[PDB]
């Protein structure tokens, strides 16, 4: 999906600036959204079209 609003950019920029690239990436993959949409065993796909 694309970003929904500017607060996402602010939060992720601060997360990076404070914790590094590894934490920045973990915030995406360990997020509840990835786990509910794709879970452990599904390859990510462009789901924002629907």
């Amino acid at each position: 999906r694309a970003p929904y609003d500017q607060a996402e950019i602010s939060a992720h920029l601060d997360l990076w600036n404070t914790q590094g690239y590894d934490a920045e990436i973990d915030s995406y993959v360990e997020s509840e959204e990835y786990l509910e949409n794709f879970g452990e065993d599904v390859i990510p796909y462009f789901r924002g079209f629907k």
Binding site: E30, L35, E36, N37, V42
Partner: protein, 69 residues
């Protein structure tokens, strides 16, 4: 995982007692389903948020083992 504290990872044996399937009945199975018992291996740097997410979901863990020593 460069520093020593990053390593010494742990392995968690997780059971799927119905307390999470009862909520997912309402949330929905919009991904293919899997069996009940499965084991995950998590590094120390995110052990706590890992099992915290599992319990937010509602997972029941039978045993937790230390992978390194």
């Amino acid at each position: 995982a460069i520093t020593t504290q990053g390593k010494r990872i742990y392995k968690i044996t997780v059971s799927e007692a119905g307390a999470y399937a009862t909520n997912k009945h309402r949330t929905g199975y919009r991904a293919p389903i899997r069996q009940s018992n499965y084991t995950l291996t998590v590094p120390y740097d995110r052990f706590l948020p890992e099992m915290i997410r599992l319990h937010q979901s509602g997972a029941k863990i039978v045993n937790v083992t230390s992978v390194i020593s």
